A paper describes a structure:
Here, we reveal the extended and contracted atomic structures of an intact contractile-tailed phage (φCD508) that binds to and penetrates the protective S-layer of the Gram-positive human pathogen [name]. The virion can be divided into five distinct regions: the head, neck, tail, baseplate, and needle. Structures of purified φCD508 virions in both extended and contracted conformations were determined by single-particle EM of frozen-hydrated samples; the resolution ranged from 2.6 to 4.0 Å for the extended phage, and 2.9 to 4.2 Å for the contracted form.
Contraction of φCD508 in urea reduces the tail length by just 20%, whereas most CIS tails that have been described contract to ∼50% of their extended length; the outer diameter of the sheath increases from 230 to 250 Å, and the inner diameter from 78 to 94 Å, sufficient to break contacts between gp55 sheath domain I helices and the tail tube gp56. The contracted sheath retains the arrangement of gp55 subunits in a six-stranded helix, but with a decrease in helical rise from 39 Å to 32 Å, and a concomitant increase in twist from 19 to 34°. The measured 20% reduction (48 nm) in tail length is consistent with a decrease in helical rise from 39 Å to 32 Å for 57 rings of sheath protein. The contraction-induced movement of the gp55 sheath proteins can be modeled as a rigid body pivoting motion about domain I. The overall RMSD between sheath protein monomers in the extended and contracted form is 0.63 Å, confirming a rigid body movement of these proteins. In both the extended and the contracted form, the sheath ring retains integrity through its mesh network, similar to the sheath of other CISs. In helical reconstructions of the contracted tail, the tail tube cannot be resolved because of a mismatch between the helical parameters of the sheath and the tail tube. Furthermore, the X-loop blocks complete contraction of the tail for φCD508; we modeled the φCD508 sheath proteins into a more contracted conformation, based on pyocin trunk structures, but increased contraction of φCD508 sheath proteins led to steric clashes between the X-loop and the neighboring N-terminal linker, as well as domain II of a neighboring sheath. In the contracted phage tail, which lacks the packing interactions between the tail tube and the sheath, the bending stiffness (persistence length) is also significantly reduced.
Author numbering:
A (entry chain S): 13 to 472
B (entry chain M): 317 to 472
C (entry chain L): 13 to 79
Write the structure that this text describes.
């Protein structure tokens, strides 16, 4: 640059930061409003969810999004599910100067929907040629504007202000004629999003979700069986492909605790978590899958350095309600069920559906926190792939560098206290059999536990 | 001193996109195809069209880096032609000088770590049959490999 | 395989082992329940015996198996 003393101030995020959030979650959702056919990330502010997908609790989108956000996920990734017939609302405007009136402007909702987004056009009381363009939803006004009677400036203004973000205006003809007055005319022709949604839509959503990486998946708070087996196979495929995705599920409200335990027996992969209990938060019930959304969100928000075995929930009630016998039955079945151990609703344990089996996949694998730990180690290691694969020569120096980097990572874990003991070394047994263009290595560790049970004995 | 089997590319998208079955099919066919192993576009492997065949032209010949190495050795050697052809007398001294120069070159390669092991010597089998105005020589080497595959096993 | 860094975790029997057992024994048995006409090996967990030959002490099978 030219000589001088040029300041560039950067008080962007000086101390406007907090560290109370973590994790990311996947969400196929049915929605009346918002983008369609894309996987969109949502920051934890619910205002973003409300803006980008509406505020209708009749739909899985807003309700499950609110539950996930209250789960304190750092970034919530959504995908709007639709049938192919799903459509945008639309309205058309016409001129009045000519006896044979001609359509000159068309209004269409910015996102596909079927809501009663309405529009009003009336004569401007100040200027003769101006028309006052006002927009509503069921007469609840969104935005008002006034432009002279030329179509180009009218559509440009209507598309300019983001107060009119609900609707897009397009020019039908290049007229300079006075528009026709409308009063609360709905943008018709749209279709909602709950229309004929089937397993194929969920399959397409999952195929879209293959692109990204996630900490957990919950399947739209829907307990349809065939979707559950499909997602089970999909997660197994993703695991075999090096994508370590965890899955939470919730049974149907009609299922008895015996049926829920049978389903939790049917699932035995460690990445499957079955939720049995229903709950109420704002005096409104939530099916086991709807609360499975929340428990998955809370789990991913916990991340490492935590668990869920007694994490307090937002729910004001829980049902069905279990004695210690029923709780033990559910845990032995691998079911996760909420509890009312105190005046609040409390998560009973960290169990997953796998826990029915014991020894080879160890008992700690029956707990979700260990699976999150293993998936995190696999993810960081598969991040190291690109640092080390195809970039170092397999000699003693390259092996030493790889081992030193992994040792530094595990020592960082040790510094956090997550691991009580570890060692990482070359797998000389397999390294002897290794081909010259490959490397084998081994590591042992001991994750630091957490009190689930405590016992006290008193003397007087 | 490098390869392409995981070199990051500048490309923001790649198509057509392949499962591991398709990738294995392409590699067995000798095809080179880009991949989206992460958020970027990444080169899958070092393979060439030859790789369909295996043993005589060895499996390392199926990889482009080995061919680049062999071509470089041939090029430097065919650079040495002008230094040695028609300029030294084929006696024991000339043969020793040629062998010493080639040994120095291969030791320079060893210093760079590209070669893990080598030996270079007169091809006494063909040198016995060699005409008086020519020279035969032999060399073995071991190019240093690179991790393409890595496997880890965990204990808790 | 294709190039990559593919983990395969093997926390099967990390430290879930003990050395308090040895030996093998033959047993012709009368039983109300279980397989017939085959020589079946039973691991020392009595639950395996109970599953594969019942839990009736009236028969040589369960009683002598427990012993």
């Amino acid at each position: 640059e030219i000589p001088g003393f040029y300041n560039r101030f950067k008080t962007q995020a000086e101390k406007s930061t907090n560290t109370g959030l973590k994790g990311r979650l996947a969400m196929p959702i049915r929605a009346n409003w918002g983008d369609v056919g894309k996987v969109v990330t949502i920051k934890n502010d619910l205002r973003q969810l409300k803006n980008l997908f509406g505020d209708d609790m009749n739909y899985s989108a807003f309700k499950l999004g609110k539950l996930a956000l209250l789960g304190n996920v750092k970034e919530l990734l959504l995908y709007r599910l639709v049938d192919g017939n799903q459509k945008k609302g639309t309205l058309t405007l016409k001129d009045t100067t000519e006896n044979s009136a001609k359509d000159v402007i068309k209004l269409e909702t910015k996102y596909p929907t079927a809501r009663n987004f309405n529009v009003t056009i009336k004569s401007n009381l100040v200027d003769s040629d101006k028309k006052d363009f006002i927009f509503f939803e069921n007469t609840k006004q969104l935005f008002s504007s006034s432009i002279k009677g030329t179509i180009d400036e009218i559509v440009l203004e209507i598309n300019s202000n983001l107060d009119n973000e609900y609707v897009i205006a397009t020019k039908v003809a290049d007229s300079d004629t006075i528009l026709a007055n409308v009063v609360n005319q709905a943008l018709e022709g749209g279709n909602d999003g709950c229309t004929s949604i089937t397993n194929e839509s969920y399959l397409k959503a999952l195929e879209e979700f293959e692109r990204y990486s996630f900490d957990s998946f919950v399947l739209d708070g829907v307990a349809d069986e065939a979707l559950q087996e499909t997602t089970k196979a999909w997660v197994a495929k993703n695991k075999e492909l090096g994508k370590d995705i965890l899955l939470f599920l919730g049974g149907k409200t009609e299922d008895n605790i015996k049926q829920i335990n049978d389903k939790s027996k049917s699932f035995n992969d460690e990445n499957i978590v079955n939720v049995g209990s229903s709950a109420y938060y704002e005096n409104i019930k939530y099916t086991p899958s709807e609360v499975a959304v929340y428990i998955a969100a809370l789990s991913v928000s916990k991340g490492i350095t935590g668990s869920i075995c007694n994490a307090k929930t937002i729910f004001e009630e829980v049902e069905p309600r279990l004695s210690q016998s029923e709780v033990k039955e559910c845990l032995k079945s691998g079911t996760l069920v909420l509890d009312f151990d105190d005046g609040d609703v409390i998560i009973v344990d960290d169990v997953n559906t796998f826990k029915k089996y014991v020894d080879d996949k160890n008992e700690a694998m029956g707990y979700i926190s260990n699976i999150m730990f293993i998936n995190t180690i696999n993810k960081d290691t598969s991040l190291k792939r690109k640092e080390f694969v195809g970039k170092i020569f397999n000699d003693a120096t390259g092996q030493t560098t790889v081992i030193c980097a992994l040792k530094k990572y595990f020592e960082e874990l040790m510094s956090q206290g997550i691991i009580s003991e570890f060692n990482v070394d070359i797998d000389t047994e397999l390294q002897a059999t290794a081909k010259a263009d490959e490397f084998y290595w081994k590591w042992d560790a001991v994750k630091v536990d957490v009190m689930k049970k405590i016992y006290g004995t008193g003397y007087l």
